[model samples]
Target: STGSATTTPIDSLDDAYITPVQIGTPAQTLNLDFDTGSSDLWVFSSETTASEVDGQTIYTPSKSTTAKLLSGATWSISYGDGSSSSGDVYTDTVSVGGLTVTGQAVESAKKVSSSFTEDSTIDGLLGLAFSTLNTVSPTQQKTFFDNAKASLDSPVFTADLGYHAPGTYNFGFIDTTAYTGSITYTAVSTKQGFWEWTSTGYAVGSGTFKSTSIDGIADTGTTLLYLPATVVSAYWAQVSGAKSSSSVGGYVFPCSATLPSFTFGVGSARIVIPGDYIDFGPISTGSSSCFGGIQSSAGIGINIFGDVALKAAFVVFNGATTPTLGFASK
Candidate 1:
């Protein structure tokens, strides 16, 4: 989903459109993955001494007309995936499309890991998802949306992914044409991170798994839906004559048959996962088949309702009027 732009209706609000941000002082335009799970606007920097920062888009201070360095302030971030980077703080006038935010906070990392350094063209990540997850402290932190909110015609952000198509990722104000009626919104809780919610339950094909409990956080940074092993096993058991095979590690079924359709209930919304997505490939060396929607994660934690699940519905990350997540178009 690279280099293509589409418009999506954000909630019932009419002025929402995909928001873009400039990284460096004078400003180098880059598409960012607006994440609510964490708070931080990270981009590769041209000042990085390491070669790993190559290929990725680096915000160069020299290129930006308005760039200022925070001499004593340095920044570093580490993720659960063991990827991390560190750099100095720089201030600059950044713009997104027609909207310009001045004296914005930016990070210029001098040392970056291979994950970020390897992507020569990948650039950096922009976290518009939520402020709670921001890596920068509240005192010094300012998101693109936070800076531009006063100038925006509307106070909402909507994301529309075009699936596997060439230009699938589109962000901005919501388009009214894509939806019907007003959008339902849920207030964000003061959780450790972004306010996350538990899905009411799950269903497969026409069968509703009433006893099965599922909780998920709507996260855009994640690419796939991460499910519990128990859920995966139970789901696989329903397939006709499909048994856990030794050839495949966990739950392998006869590849010859078509898989069943699965649905998940997030509060009032019921999202259906395509049969093909349910029968994804095994994650291990052996043929233990893995459920497309459900996979094996070591310990029990929150399930991630990533981009795959989000595609089935309309999502509004409301940062302007309120700190809440609005869901519609299921």
Candidate 2:
């Protein structure tokens, strides 16, 4: 049997998917962002002083008998998007769908960045990344999936991200009905704690496919796809009125501009990102300019196959000894 849950995309935010998760004994349900890029199950809570707790639903550890304080334990997490949170630790039961893990590490936030404080929708993050990326001090924390995997019928999970609709995340089992066509698998090297892999090559629209191997992480939390600056520049060149906007910190184009599609090679399977996905949307309401979904990862030094790329395909994050990334058309 597999445990699964619905992942709802926030259309207003333009990025992010929330998963229903329960923590503690009596159960406090929080709409958490299941992040595969970072590892740490931290939540807004009673431990977070009233001044720091704004629009978030706080987690009250005292309310659950099963909740235990991990003495002297603390966690700090900074996201790639510049958001961050930090706090004390609690050991409690965590549940997602039909799966449960007892004595799982839960980080209670005492402080959060303005980015998080302003975003009222997300209560916390349930990291599905490797355990090595966990933030707990003195000892690393295991994700709910990791702790529960040993007892699960199978050690695999599938992320079916939708453009703006609800999607499903399945664990312990893969639903054959969720996707069409055969799943193409590619070897992954996770030394960086991410489901990092190298794409065989890529092509801009129907142009000649280059054997330019690109390494990137399969990150669900990231909103846009990030590639090398040169790659982004080459793709944007195909869009009329597109330019590198220093003001916006990315490539921007006239909202009405026609954009070409981008494709990545996963073994022999070519996953193509539609032209519209490249034209993210208007930079602001009433503005006739749009930000390109594909951005430069030069500053970060690591390319990312974020939500923009994942939402275009049904992704299977194979947890085998040599983790593999399986992709299929949705």
Candidate 3:
């Protein structure tokens, strides 16, 4: 009917967040990154090669009596950041928080990229985007969220991302106490298999709204907020000693600079991101320059409303027949 889970930021920079998930029988709990940008419930499993396995918790399907191989089925997936994983598929009992789904397709990774192997904080990822984006071959499989949607009291899930603290993800129903004011709902397009929508406009601190239409996806998997070059430039212009450089990682400015707040419109509602949130911390330990959380999306093609932006509000991912997104100030 309903389920709730706590998502904790893995590092001080909030580079990623992870939630505990139970896979197979006897409840092999592993911390997985709940990603909203892609669809494919994959895991670091016993099937993974030793070279690819490091400090991650691995799921052993052989220990579960309910596990069954999805014969002839395979899956492969890659991210924009170049991290990738692929392997055979299996069906087993999967649970998130208090929610459980039987015979859920779980991709067990046999191979993982160097980035994944180097990052020991996450065991795998549980994709919450549309099932159409699934990478399973021969037959496309439904994501855990999609498979459990019909059984939920409501086909909706909410993301309450935090800066450095732990946040909560609620399935089936919305928690009125978790947010303030009224929610602003917007139509969503799954054309590219993402929670894609058009934002009204944006403002640099107390400045005027640009009234421009910006299309982007709500991606919890990504760490930074990416907008048009014009918009990013405007925000940085207010800060002294700011410059863009790939060598130091995107836009950087004086660590002591007074960064301005960023405001974005959702219909008539406005979500203001605190200046401190934009300060992504010093470029390096004890460095005088700090990396910005907001960057130009020109090279990325479409804008990305990643964790940097999503953390500013309580977001709803409605999976009803008519998909829509809801935003509320927290």
Candidate 4:
């Protein structure tokens, strides 16, 4: 949910998607991207160009009696994927699930991507990730965690992602009762925008391929797991007759064999990623198929443990109390 402090450009519309949460009586949905890279919830407005606003759900201020436009304020954001959107500032009542926070700051994009301009499902994103990338200035920036900190049942928010279905991604409360064992909390390292950690080593099947320690970051915004090339090659070497084929953006494996268990260390806590995730199909455009869980990163500076890793643990991002990250079972 956190990453390097550097800002990534948002170039393509597919890089970001929006989910709308209704506001006021007879709740109306708007389209929003659930971004952790930046905080500040906004939506496209009626003034945006048809192409720029295509696929996006617009929130009409007229629809809500309580919606108030904020004059003299402008907001814009760009992602690493070369996508960007910007618009005027507005304030309105926003709600997620049964929780409601009034006067929440929302931005109405005067210009957006054609892909986002056409969709009419939800309004805008519910940024539940860390606050380091918040677009809102310190004086004006107000994150969902910042607003709900006092009212939340616990000092944490956990996101449960779905592979093919709408998973139970909850906020405002941490239900520790579901965890029968003890909980482990890791102090947030003041390093990058992503929550990164050092991995002691990795294991495939029943063997530890390499004892080399590595450092990496965990990102919820990304869907696939990426590792250094050496690690990926070494892992695939162990797969019984595993072959790589071309896929989406990377390599994917087509073997039906159950892959060996892979585990990584975060401090003293050892986390395991199931084997099924390793048997990935063609998820990229390349001819080489990658293991569903681990793929070659060509020795990128940072290794990424995407949503697949977060879903295995009950993650807690406590930016309000103290900059910290905690993990537990649900």
Candidate 5:
């Protein structure tokens, strides 16, 4: 029975979206961060040090009748933010948004970095990137979307991440009613193991669009829209009292400043990022200084169209043969 599911995103921290997932025979539910930048389905688990648990949920394989340890297998993964995790492996039944896949490789975390340990809300990460990026030793694992693709009507999934509101991740088929106007499609190049694409150009405020190409990934897990340092400099120049902060590691500006919207090219598609969204939030409560949501992608090696840029549009990550991205107004 081929089917699809629309998992809801948790609206907190604006860092990444969380979705409900079931693993094992009795269907134990865990809220996992669906990350597109990396490929691995890992969760906090019983093997984790007691002190590191810190209120985060863990997936206990012993509770599931179908769970089986993959003898001698292990995995270790590091993130762009300098965070990392490692664990043992278990094969079990995994389900999301009503779609089910049995014998999925599920990693149980024995250790995690402070970033993950301190974030009590996220239980684990479900990777949506290509399966080639899976980090299991001796053998790689297939992602939930990858395992369930053939049974689906189409090898496609759409991410409609709401701005500060809950959004849905639709798998296998596109929901025409969720978006407005025709979806503009752009061919994707995954040489670097991501939804990498070259944007025709971008424009700041009401200025003309620059033909400078920005190669980047469409990452749902990342929180802000990142571009080249030059692009960032131009945008901040338009704002009064805006400057890059060494301590904050990003651009900061006046909290009450009225910034201009930014635009990027995607074939005939023009994705516009609202100015209000650029004002991340006050650096501190009742403070007149704020953190700019847009930043430089220097450390990450590529630009990222994260939540700040994605929430403004409905994005489709087509996984068939050569990947493609379809964009439409929310």
Candidate 6:
């Protein structure tokens, strides 16, 4: 069986995507961010501190007859941005799109950082990455995808993100009509529990393609495309008055700047991100400075092809015995 769901952006900047997830019995639906960068299926719940709830929705496991406590199981996770959450665990029925997984480990949040509380749209995160990355203690738990993979017609899922619009996420089967052009397939390295792969190279708008190998992970949860300083600097160089800003904590430029397109190689196929997509948005509501969607990953350790890049193409995360990734132009 296969599952399909719609993911929509939360803000004008396309900062994050949220998809409605049905959890527990009677389907207590909550909008969640399906993150490919992490593997903890956590949610804001009745256990979450009231002070941290804000305007976000919370999941109540008590209402579900199928809910069972995963005795002594606890979990904690921290993100690159320093935002974090921790909680106890429970086993419940979880469903995404049309696919259902019984006995899914549902981590109930006891505490969450201010950043998560401030974002009222996201109720939790559904991890699509490998199970090895799960943070549950005593015994780490399997992600929703991992538990459902065996029952799926094919152990694969696809992400088709959109720019400031609703996108689709599919499990088990790839929708051939969702993308155009042939897919470029490449082997994935699951050593890090991430959908990691190496790109042939990248090129600035209208520039010759560079042949250097660039290793990165495809993270649907992250908001920007982060590459090496050399590549980032090269792209920004084409836009006059653009500079890396210390105050803003990233690369910024005049909101009116004519940004150049970014292209990266997946085998022989070239996926090009339009110039407008790089002009993230004004740094502030009415600020004259705009943030660049593409930034330097010199401090991040690993390059990341986040939503900014993922929105420009179709991506497949194949979980077969020998995992692989497929990229195609949409």
After superposing candidate 4 on the true structure, give the runs of residues whose Cα lies further than 4 Å from its correct spot: 1-20, 24-26, 31-33, 53-56, 114-123, 136-140, 177-180, 209-214, 240-248, 255-258, 278-280, 283-293, 296-301
Say which prediction, candidate 2 or candidate 3, comes out ahead on lDDT: 3
Q: Give the least accurate 10-residue stretch of model 3, judged by summed lDDT.
A: 275-284
lDDT of 1 by residue, 249-320 (tens): 345565555787667765666666767654544444464544344444434366777755665566776665
lDDT per residue as tens, model 4, 22-121: 6644566654445554566777667566666545556777777888867677777775435567777767787665567777777777776544544444
Per-residue lDDT, model 1, residue 252, is 56
The local distance difference test score of each candidate is 0.59, 0.87, 0.93, 0.58, 0.86, 0.94
RMSD per model, one decimal: 6.3, 1.3, 0.9, 6.3, 1.6, 0.7
lDDT of 2 by residue, 3-114 (tens): 8999998664447898899898799998899988987988999877677666888789999989999999999989887888899999999989878899999999999988
Candidates sorted by lDDT, best first: 6, 3, 2, 5, 1, 4
Task: Return the TM-score for candidate 5, rounded to 2 decimals.
Answer: 0.96
TM-score-wise, the better of 3 and 5 is 3
Candidate of highest TM-score = 6
lDDT string, candidate 5, 1-330, tens digits: 334444454544466678888989898888898888888999999898788888887889999999999988999999888899998999999988888888899999999999998988889999999888999989888888899888878898888887666788878888899989889998888788898888888899899898877888988878899999999899999999999999878999998899999998888678888898787787877888899989998767789988888888989999988789888986
Which is better, 1 or 2, measured by TM-score?
A: 2
Taking all chains together, each candidate's TM-score versus the true structure is 0.77, 0.97, 0.98, 0.76, 0.96, 0.99
Query: In candidate 6, what are the lDDT values of residues 1-330, reduced to their tens digit?
Result: 899999999998889999999999888999999999999999999999999998888999999999999999999999987999999999999999999999999999999999999999999999988999999998999998899999999999999999879999999999999999898999899999999999999999999999889999999989999999999999999989999998898999999888889999999999999998887888888999999999999999999999999999999999999999999999
TM accuracy, model 1:
0.77
Question: What value does the lDDT take at residue 63 in candidate 2?
Answer: 98
Q: State the lDDT at 14 in candidate 4.
A: 20
Instruction: Specify the highest-lDDT model's number.
Output: 6
How many angstroms is residue 273 displaced in model 3 relative to the true structure, after the best TM-score fit? 0.7
